[PDB]
Design a binder for this molecule. Structure first.
Ligand code: HEC
Ligand code: HEC
Lengths: 87, 87
């Protein structure tokens, strides 16, 4: 197989340049992130491993939402109003 | 219901200062993003809508993996070797 060709043909270059971050991280940045985890890169490409380069910050915020699960509709609205009041 | 009190009591201010980004976005930034979208803010608080303030870069990349369905193991390996060559 020709990895460089496949990368180009599937459009991956549009967001991934060799050394420069654009819409996506540079290939150097991705390569360095997977140092000692190289099998995991193949798993990532197969949809079988989580993103490790720029992981969604949902991981920090999502558990915080469990604290709001019992709130009433009035309490949720009040909370949202408080947030919105800033500005 | 008292939104400021609910916010204080659940520790939310630890990552959500009024005007300054910390581990999380400032309340001013969140409010700006949800201006005129209070309904979406409530949905978010209920765990029913993805984050919008700084939307996941992970969400841009995830659909791209569908480009690689039915590549063979050798092709996936070549693609990984190409990426890793930029370290
Ligand atoms: C934008 C329109 C993209 C295209 C087309 C492709 N990728 Fe991408 N990629 C993009 C972003 C914004 C990110 C950061 C989010 C993240 O998941 O890290 C990435 C990331 C990757 C990674 C790193 C995965 C990780 O462990 O975090 C890899 C290995 C990767 N991208 C590869 C890749 C391939 C092979 C593509 C063509 C099929 C491809 N990307 C397209 C944005 C975009
Ligand atoms: C760090 C330990 C956090 C605590 C405690 C709380 N939040 Fe948070 N929040 C955090 C991060 C890293 C992010 C960005 C990820 C994301 O979901 O955007 C957020 C985001 C929010 C948002 C905006 C969501 C969006 O559309 O972008 C809101 C409205 C929000 N957080 C509210 C909130 C509440 C009410 C909290 C206490 C129960 C709370 N956060 C705690 C990090 C952290």
């Amino acid at each position: 197989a020709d990895g460089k060709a496949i990368f180009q043909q599937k459009g991956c270059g549009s967001c991934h340049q060799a050394n420069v971050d654009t819409v996506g991280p540079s290939l150097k940045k991705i390569a360095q992130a997977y140092a000692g985890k190289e099998d995991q890169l193949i798993k990532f490409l197969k949809g079988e491993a989580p993103a490790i380069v720029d992981p969604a910050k949902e991981a920090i915020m999502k558990p915080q939402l469990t604290m709001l699960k019992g709130l009433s509709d009035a309490e949720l609205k009040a909370l949202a109003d408080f947030i919105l009041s800033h500005k």
